[model samples]
Target chain A: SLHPSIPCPRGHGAQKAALVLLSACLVTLWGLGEPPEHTLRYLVLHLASLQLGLLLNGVCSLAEELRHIHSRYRGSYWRTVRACLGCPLRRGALLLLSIYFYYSLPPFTWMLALLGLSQALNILLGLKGLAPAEISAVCEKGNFNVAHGLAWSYYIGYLRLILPELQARIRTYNQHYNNGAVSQRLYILLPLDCGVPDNLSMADPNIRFLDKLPQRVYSNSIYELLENGQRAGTCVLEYATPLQTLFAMSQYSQAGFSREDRLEQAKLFCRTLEDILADAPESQNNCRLIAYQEPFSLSQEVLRHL
Target chain B: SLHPSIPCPRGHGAQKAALVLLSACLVTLWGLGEPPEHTLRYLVLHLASLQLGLLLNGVCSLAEELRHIHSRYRGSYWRTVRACLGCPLRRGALLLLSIYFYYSLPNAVGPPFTWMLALLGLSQALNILLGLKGLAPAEISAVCEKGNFNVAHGLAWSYYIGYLRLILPELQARIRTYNQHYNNGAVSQRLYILLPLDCGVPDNLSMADPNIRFLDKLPQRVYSNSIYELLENGQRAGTCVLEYATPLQTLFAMSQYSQAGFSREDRLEQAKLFCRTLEDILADAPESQNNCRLIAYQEPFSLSQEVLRHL
Candidate 1:
């Protein structure tokens, strides 16, 4: 189980590497050793500068559109834009202008040398088009639930766009028909350590969030979870933790050794999910819980007829 | 019995009359002959310029804040920023800079220096001349008259809170300022305004919009720009002036106005309340009154407290 990270092409290492190169570019630009511009030393300095400059510029550009999508996802344009300050564009412009000023100095700096080394290492490692596995969520809409998704943290960060929407829709439902319109309950199943979520949760300090709200909150309005109501207001969710599903898969595959000495093994694996749904409250909403057995390598052993 | 307007101490006509005198003083500064600095003409012109410049400068400052509130009310920081163009600030800065340049010149030109330098004086003169001309609010009669401003283009700080929290599209719509009554359980929006703005108004809304009448009885695509507050004689009544009922529009109102979570009972009440209010608005306006849709809201400022007393 690799650690989760919001997937981005730039990757975590690349984001960190720029700081080292930015310091290098700044040092050379300072003429620290009084290096001559007409030589390889000057040219080498130039490569580092452009790489760090352009890389950040790319991040700024990506940040802008992500903000746009997040704003839409969050459902409140002004609130997002107000806090957002339209920063990415402003920051991008500032970056480009700084690069422009640097162009006026020492005929520029950094880095043909850095780029060449990065190029050779790229050929050396050659990994491509890969992403961290998603801790996927299966979502359903109910009379009570709005809609919520997980694993979008890289772009959305602390703002879970759907939660406040759930909050709003819930408030709207509760005040009508005398007793209420929809019931609110939300359930999420994950390893207790699964953590892209904790960063994105919030508020009502005590208006709703209490101790049990975080505990077996597998089904209920979970008022504290409302975070302004974009998550669940009056919805029902049932949980079967990640390990619960795997016990069935692990029981059949590993317990009997690799020998599915019978295709009867797959039924046992598939039945875990069947029973999982069987265990959830009989849903009029047919909001059934599904299982995950295809953690890759197992599928080959499990799929005979297909 | 009384319309709410904060009348000023200066009589409105007297305010208008000052403009007449100021322009004469302006032409004097521009030399309608013998305007000596030691003469009454010079002193009078100085007073006029000071009075007019400061008056309009104050208006520009006020315009800046009004635009800020309007932006917040409209609910799109960028949307408001894009349309607003930061005009009041720019205009205010331009007025100050023009004043600086004018003082720099005439003292440094005219009676002595380069003839072209004197021409530079004319440029600053005109700069100061027309620069003060735009967006002035008379103390006695402001264009964004207390009740006329689009305090909220119907949306508020956030989309979720963007429900008709005291929204009124047109100031003339009675609900604009009187939000508490509209929100109070005692009044059904139309039941309050169901006593229509115009009792015997013609329904010659002549089966309006052929495309709407031709196809779906409901218009799914209402012009967002068509948003406006329903108005009574001199102020807001409540909510909109009607639209083609874009489907999302209905559900949003459905949830906003009731506790029902899209239930049948809730939706029916939503539909009827939605229907009657929209209908009353339609009936109030003759089709030729240039049909408008609605969006607008609360005056959070102290001004609202001063004026909301008619409740």
Candidate 2:
């Protein structure tokens, strides 16, 4: 029996067959054309195997869950592998192997080998132990789970050390590109209405959509929040650092403007960034916005005043 | 020629002959033992060959550098076999091989095949992308010269993304086992010493090394300029919405209380990391130690009085 709402079994089978045939053809074409055909073929086949394995595992697991079957012979075989390995153990092993492989080739191989030897020598001499091992011992001594908790603690500590510098480098790079330079012409449209109209008093719904133009540039409509969390919400004027926004607007104005207009707007935007920097104390002093609420403004006419 | 200061070289020919004979005797004895003395002999010989090869390569490279020699070869000549042929480009290659190996082997191969596969798969992927990529790219980039800037940028981004997450996961796993919470110890130390210590005085260095006793349980030196620079030069702190230092120190103290103390300390010392959730506010604050200097309390007693009064 065929229904409008549901696909018939034959239709489903045909779709599946088409997908399989397409995948097979792609694999064949990719395999036939290359000098490194073996390597490419292996990779493709391997990926296919992984997908198939995952699907089979997923289906089997779902069936097991539905039937309440938990026996090793029945459907809990993979579960045993997961339990025995544990997430951390698996991840750690993976990480160590990656480290090994990375240095296993060429220029790094020698350095890593040397370093590993030196480390091993230290260990053999009782001068030092591997960090992971040490962390495990520490956690154990502290009456915590040496296997899980202490491992992550050490890992987190290491991350805190370097994250700041990476961020700074990136910021410096971004700022260098942005420093009063006119790069791209941004098309900006100003609304016929100067400010947001009171939604209740808006005579035409079209005007509301028109009012939404600037708002859309910033973020999605409020209606989006009802549909999906992944949807972008409101954009606050405070989204970018004041300096960045001003830099952006200045660059936008400077790109195509005549010399006089460019100079005027460039100075204006530059001064704006500076003003933002100076008024930071005031800007931060305002009460923070809640999740759903539009950010509070000193006045409804804040943008107009600017 | 036979000086007593250095071990008198058993003058080559006769001594070498004696040593060779002795080696032969030892080999014979080993050969008489189970598992074949030949296997041990072969292992020793193979190890010697590897060592010699490494030593020769090192010497040649050193000589080349001294002579300012440029090579016609770019991709490793010595590693041609592995680099050219046997090397798998992508990660899942090993897993494929492992599966094949498992089916190919007898039952005696056992469950270890899966374990080996898992290890190989993990090592290949991560070591390349996370562990080796940064160091390797920098070297390769230097060699190529053309891609030096790109390589540096690539390495920086890779290190930024990879090192932080990898280290954090490892760090958190390490700290979960601590019996004594760091809050009590840290609060006492901060209240007594760290918060009040004069920033300039070397004698009152406890403030700089926040992971000190009473307060010493923290893993890192909190106030030191060097320490501040080490944590991504406080770049992460500037953009981050959290404070990692306090919690990180606590974790370190917890992780380092026993057998693994030093290793915990070393791991905690890596400056690049994901900001802790606790450190998020610090990340946003302009006054973050990375961006601005902490007020110098030249004298603790006076500083305390001033702090109390200000409060």
Candidate 3:
């Protein structure tokens, strides 16, 4: 079923190989003469070839995969594939890849890479501090659901503060490039999302805070999905559990979080740690340790109570 | 109840007129000056003004209307009026006037004026051809509830044709701009009037037809409204008669009217004319010349024989 994989043309991985060759050619040419007389023609040719090759490869691979799948399940291949890849997981992967490619351009690459690194660190720290067994233990004792619920609630609260900062950075760059409309459409900026209150007297404090930000910052449907999930949770239950918590996190990390749902799992883990620490004995002195354990700051008193 | 009406600034009578001036100016400038530099500047100024003015006017008008309704129904009168007029419409008007002035400049006025005239003629002709009465008369009659069932059915047939044309245009446009992805958010190239069909089947023709041409020509909500209205009409007895019919015309026009519908009134009138012509021949036009009586189009006809009556 499998074809031999092709080695990287430049002896680096595909992504890095493409970048390195393009960069090396550009730099070596730069040393030769004035850019106007030498650079653009060669640069354009190389880029076009690379783009065409990538496109052709994508089409060929896609066609081959379709043929393979057609034979693999005889009558039920598509259904089997769908069951293995849930809609949300598929959607989330596409979204992450899109955001990664979108921001992987010249200017925003460093920021996106940095964000990916920071999120990775946050996930690792969360796993180390709050193991799956610990969460399962709480679940077995019927305390885990409470912990999960509280953890989600706290994560949502923290996200309300942190997500905007990331959005603002994207907006700032987009506006600088005079691509504000693209930014807005890509982000999903409803008129209500643009500093307007949905309701006057009974205002959502979270939404109210969101309203003050520029329209360009949260112009995408992701923001709407996040708000919708939040509102549904707030209206129906005091706290939403693991899935809702993860959905909210994915919605918030529009241009970051390279994986579909690992971020949600990571977020839940962090919340679980807070839940465990909150129920811990005060005499144990785990307050400061737990507070510094996660990316966002938590209160010592909250941890002691846990 | 008449409020003081503010006079529009000079040459602000028609929207097309302003566009004409700008076009003329830009074209003339391009003709007279260096190619790239002259064209670039004109494009920049033209696009910027249109973009900025459009957003400002569109948003402010919406906000003003919102405030007006909110205040009239829920708040104090003084607060209402104050809030409604807080943002001056003058800003948008001024931009229009400024563009007009630039077009009037001797170096660039000719092409813009010509463009404006063409646009004006086209718009007027469009208004005449597709006006409320002319384009979809049966649909209008149904909307007002004066249309008979026969008339409604005939119009529906025509509407079916028109609807196809509109859908074809949209389908072409979407294909031009589709980006493949799961949920392909912006890849939703269609006007959102109907859901795109992923599978190829007779029932999915409408979805497959949504593409670039239709998209360029219409808004997303138009499709949304059409499907919504179709469902509503099927669900409810007395849904808006014109809504679905008008949408049908949109697609029919694009499809080039493969099907045609005639009004029942036209059919009835033709029948009466035939009866009069037949009767006159049989009576040898005897009393008609002396009496000079006018034969009305709606006059009733009776058959002289049993077979004729039955027919």
Candidate 4:
């Protein structure tokens, strides 16, 4: 099976190049019968769509790489990437390709012509909101994900489009509440290595699993994973790390547990995770069980192999 | 007539010098009747008291100068003093005198001798709280007041006597209240020039008139007077400038007023003060500005300049 971290299918690069050439040929043939203005408009729209597809693919690949890096070194991925040239080179190439496709197209030519008409008006009129459904349809056609790619593409597209609006709403809400109110839902992004199969079921009553996308799992709250899941209040998003989730839960805790209580809760959470993983069929048979708290405590032979 | 800005009476310099000499002589005379150790102890106590008196006097004089400068320039006194050498020199002299008296006494000599045997215990156990009543009695007995030509000395010692325990009480009271409850008593300091001598009988249901030594005032709160009457709350003191008082009142308003409301209140207060001064006996005969707001627009042959020319 292909590595889950890889964003595209086998021979995707060659397939993408062939598709680009075919699309270019098709556009040229279609434009031969059209007026110059019509041809230019047609080329502009197609090229813009093509650039967007490339951008989305690049974003997904980066997200996968980041997830993998986070799993390997929690919170040190930024430092790791900064010290390495390979990550920067790949990111730079993707960025340059997007920029070149945008500026070299007929849209840039139109923008230059409109610049003489009044740059201020041009800027004010150029603003356009992202249509998530349209972008998602295009991304689905491009095959942006590894498994059930269309749904994943749609979900990612919808999230990317609404993220800014959601952030602004959250900011205004927090200001109104003076940061006293808790969020009602918690979102969590899972590691790329973890995947929930279609047949999988979480027996935990509190955890109403919402989605099992390529790089994330949506749950109502982190409390769902803990033993005592009966609690009322808002849900906040947190990383998959058990320790980080514990801190977030402590902040959101209605009862306001002390530092000592939080430490005890953290210990209990670690044990809970171990028990759940041991009983779960997906992890029990295939995965090697290692202590999340400390990997250094494992035997010397095991450490060497790892 | 004495300048309202000056805290001390005329010939205060001569009186202070004479008092210093008398104290020294009394110390010397008393020391003659005692053994060497007892005499030394007596001298030390008397000298310490004398230093305390001098320190108090210096503090009050500084306070008067600061108040006068504040009245003239609103809040630029600190900057004015900081830029000048004379103020620093006077302040430095007082500071040096206090430090020298406190440190260079025979305490150091005795302390070193005591240091050879369990000195740490002596050092830790030597701390003592000043009794406000005893200090006040001593200051009173010294005839430290305006008639005695030691107005500054008396005012300073009075403040020093009440300062510590008042601070302690205010601190504990604030700790009990936190930020939940507003303080009942507002402390205000008025400039001597703006004394409301008559139409002032402070019998407000909400406030208690705490003091009336220097000027006429009615406050349901604490009103103190020297060159300026200082009041204390939460161990912090604030001036009684109209703007400052407005802020304090707004804080103590129980139901907080909006910023715009506070600004309107400030304008109303200025108009009230103008009306009061315009109708006062002191201004009715001598002043001819007609309107306080248009004082700057008076012609070159204005009443004040014409009076000055006549003089």
Candidate 2 yields a Cα-based lDDT of 0.26
Real contacts recovered, all predictions: 0.01, 0.00, 0.00, 0.00
Alpha-carbon lDDT, every model = 0.27, 0.26, 0.28, 0.29
lDDT of 2 at B81: 22
- Model 2 off-target regions past 4 Å? A1-285, A289-306, B1-89, B107-311
Relative to the unseen true structure, what is the C-alpha lDDT of residue B76 in candidate 3, on a scale of 0 to 100?
Answer: 47
Chain A TM-score relative to the true structure, per candidate: 0.22, 0.16, 0.21, 0.20
Who wins the DockQ comparison? 2
In the range A1-306, model 1's lDDT, one tens digit per residue, is 111211111122222332333344445435434334443332332333333333432332233323343212233544333322223454446446545544554301122222222322222232110111100000011111110101111002211233334444445555633432344323333221111122112312212332222210121233322423333332332232222322322333212212221121222222322333333333222332222232122112111101
Ten contiguous residues minimizing lDDT sum, candidate 4 chain A = A143-152
Model 4 reaches an interface RMSD of: 43.0
Looking at candidate 4 chain B, the ten consecutive residues that score lowest on lDDT are B124-133
Candidate 3 lDDT at A131 equals 18
> Model 2 interface RMSD, in angstroms?
25.6
lDDT of 4 by residue, A84-181 (tens): 22245654564466556557544243222222212222112321111222122222233211122111121222332333344345455556554234
Residue-level lDDT tens digits of model 1 in B173-221:
4433344533541211221121111111123212321111111121110
TM for candidate 1 is 0.20
Q: State which candidate has the highest lDDT.
A: 4
**RMSD (Cα, Å) of candidate 4?**
42.4
Model 1: lDDT to the true structure? 0.27
Candidates, ranked, lDDT: 4, 3, 1, 2
Candidate 3 local lDDT, A18-87, one digit each (tens): 2333454345444444435223332232233223222222222233233334222223545324322223
Evaluation by DockQ, superior candidate among 2 and 3: 2
Compose the digit string of candidate 4's lDDT tens values, residues B164-278: 2133334333323432343643422211122221112132311222321222232211332221123332222322212111111211221122211223322222223222322
